[PDB]
Amino acid sequence: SLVDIFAKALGNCVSASDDALEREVRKFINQYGRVETIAAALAVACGQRNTENLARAAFIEYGGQPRLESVRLSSRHDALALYLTRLVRTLWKAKVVQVGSGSDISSTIPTSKLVTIQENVERLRNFLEANKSTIQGLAPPDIANQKEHQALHALQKLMESISEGISFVLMLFDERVSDIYARLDAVSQQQLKDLTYEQLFSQTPGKELAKVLVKAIVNRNIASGANVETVADALRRRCGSFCSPDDVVTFKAQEQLQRASEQAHNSPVLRALLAESLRLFEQVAGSLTPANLTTAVEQYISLKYYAGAIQLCLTVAQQKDRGNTALSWVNDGKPANDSRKKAFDERKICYNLIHQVLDKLESDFLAATKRMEAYNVVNDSSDEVFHFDLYEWYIEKGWTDRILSIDSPHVITYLQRLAETDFRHAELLCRFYTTRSRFFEAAQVQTNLAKSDLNISLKDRIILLSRAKGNASVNTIGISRQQQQQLNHEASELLEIAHIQDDLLERLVADPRIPEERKAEIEEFLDGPIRTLTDLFNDYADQANYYDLCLLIFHAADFHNPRTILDTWNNLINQSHFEAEQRREYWEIAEPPLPYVYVSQQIQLIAHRTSLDSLIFPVNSLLPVVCAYAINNGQDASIGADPCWPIQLFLNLGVPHALVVQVLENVLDTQEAPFTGRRRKLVVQWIAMAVDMWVREVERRGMGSWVSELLGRADQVLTQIAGTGEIASLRRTVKGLKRSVD
């Protein structure tokens, strides 16, 4: 145990050094207090070797300890807070800069002072890291030592925050500072003028403003263009935790972009600058900012770099959302007040830029190359949310031909959703179908379109049905003619009802006898989707006494009530005569037509619009009514009219002569008023001219005994009328015609 004697002999020198210190320390403690003493030991340990180590030992042994939710921390802590506060007392509350509006700018604190301050702070941090194991509280550890550990941690975070802050101020005045301040916003110039170091060290606005200034100095550094990658590594390391590595790569991208605008006159040097700038942008695509993307695209369009800028926009749009949530978002359709309004919105920021590329691309115009290289990236893009945003923009510009010429993975998918709930594309798909030659479907769409609940005026729905009735009927390759005629018949019926409703709306809106408070509701209910013939009839038509339209409704509906038909015909005749007599009276006080002419015009309007079917127009029952009207109202030679205008009216419409003579036979034989007495002389004049135009029709073209019977039967009527009372000259004209027939 030889060495043990030397060891315990060393132990004889231990207590000599300890008791010397312990006594010496306490003399300084009791006189200056506990706080000031520990604070002195820390300063001496930072160099303010054995001397500096003794100061380290005193700082450990007699620093106290934390003890008491409120906690009283050790004197060792309060000493560190004091020393730190003293090292920065000259710049903490001071403004960072001194600026004048007239081209003045300067630092409040001299740079030499900032350097010495930074070296003192790093000496402190270096001491804490070089003694992380010996100092209590620095190593992880109850509540007393915890809040002790937390308060000390917050201090160290403030130290490095101070060091990075000072290094940022020194870097600021290394580059030209008057340049950035001139191109700065009034808010940022304002925040900077009253910017204190404390806000820089211990608050967010100083950090946010610092992030703005760095983003601005590099912009300027590129204009001077001394070195980008050196200013990069300068900001990357020292003031890290305040600079961002995604920003330096962006700065590296804006470097080539601006230097591509510097070398702009050169031809072969840019395709390496712009291509490498594009590589740099796509890396930080998921972190790129819309503002920086805008400035890049603007410089890209100015350098005629269209195709590359589009691919970048698609990348950034793709990068923000790996899931492509805008797919299921839009495919389902319109979930509002959601958080997914970040996916589609940020994507559209890039799309609107792409929309600006294609504007300047066509506005400006190797051009055929850049143009083709551009539209290739567009159409060959995988992002369909872009395609959906693109087709909306093309149509917005009226570039319809570009829609139909291009074929894309969702041009059908897109219009199939838009057109189904929107009127525009329901007409554009059709034009697309024409070129695609799916002619049959265009009618079905135009059919289901006119039948839809969309906001379509009644006259526009007529166009769709007029086209739908015409579209399917042309191809001749359509699969089933039995199905084709079904669509054509369905369209022909709707077109008939729509015209009636349109004519009804036209007359109703223009009717004086209708009050204006009702016309707004008429055009509200009519000018739109097509109504049922029952609604059109009962709602207004019947109430409006539009007997002509009621007859068209009866024809369109195949309604089988000949009595209501004939009553409507009589009401039509008497109404047309009433108005025509009122207009003839006002003219006697252009010359309007006589009553029977106006009545004949209303019949011919219905007779030409509706085919002369037997059910829709009854000759055997309706001719006596017009003949009765011609007599009852004196519409004959007593007003200058042809007494046979009712017969000429029917024959010129297409009614066969045999049926006309067959009715007049029933009129002459039944002797129903007004066809009685001496007025049966006019019934003979009708038959005479009717047969006269009949034999002229047989002689022109090149009938039986019951015709020759009636002619001899009317002779007794003339002698009967000649007894109760030209007639002699008419009997000879009839007998002369009887010879020609026989």
In this structure, is residue 514 part of a structural domain?
no
Q: For residue 336, give both structure tokens.
A: 């509002």
- 243's CB contacts (< 8 A; 6+ apart) are 214, 235, 236
Helix-helix angle 204-224:143-174, to 10 degrees: 30
In this structure, is residue 513 part of a structural domain?
no
In this structure, is residue 554 part of a structural domain?
no
Quote the number of domains for the chain: 5
Report d(CA 76, CA 144) in Å as an integer: 13
Contact 494, 451 (CB under 8 A): yes
Domain boundary, last residue among 614, 643, 672: 643
Backbone angles phi, psi at 106, to 5 degrees: -175, 165
Closest Cα to residue 229, out of 270, 184, 259, 267?
Answer: 259
Same domain, residue pair 187 and 72: yes
Q: Tell me which DSSP letter residue 639 carries.
A: G
In this structure, is residue 488 part of a structural domain?
no
Report d(CA 644, CA 631) in Å as an integer: 11
Q: Tell me which DSSP letter residue 340 carries.
A: G
Report d(CA 702, CA 538) in Å as an integer: 51
- Burial class from Cβ neighbours inside 10 Å (0-12, 13-18, 19+) for residue 391 reads buried
Report d(CA 694, CA 369) in Å as an integer: 80
Closest Cα to residue 675, out of 716, 624, 722, 639?
Answer: 624
Contact 411, 391 (CB under 8 A): yes
Contact 653, 604 (CB under 8 A): yes
State this model's resolution in angstroms. 4.0
Closest Cα to residue 503, out of 474, 559, 544, 449?
Answer: 544
In this structure, is residue 91 part of a structural domain?
yes
Strand, coil or helix: what is 629?
A: helix
Same domain, residue pair 182 and 301: no
In this structure, is residue 416 part of a structural domain?
no
Closest Cα to residue 90, out of 69, 112, 57?
Answer: 112
Report d(CA 458, CA 529) in Å as an integer: 6
Question: Which CATH number do you get for residue 368?
Answer: 1.25.40.450
Breaks (C-N over 2.5 A) in the chain follow: 48, 68, 141, 365, 589, 702, 725
Domain boundary, last residue among 590, 613, 643: 643
- 504's CB contacts (< 8 A; 6+ apart) are 526, 536, 540, 541, 546, 549
Same domain, residue pair 98 and 238: yes
Domain boundary, last residue among 362, 379, 397: 397
Report d(CA 270, CA 296) in Å as an integer: 15
Report d(CA 225, CA 263) in Å as an integer: 12
Backbone angles phi, psi at 4, to 5 degrees: -65, -35
Same domain, residue pair 106 and 73: yes
Contact 368, 304 (CB under 8 A): no
Q: Tell me which DSSP letter residue 71 carries.
A: -
Same domain, residue pair 267 and 354: yes
- According to DSSP, the residues that pair with 67 across neighbouring strands are 72
Residue 3: give the domain boundaries. Answer: 1-25+36-60
Q: For residue 373, give both structure tokens.
A: 């290289």
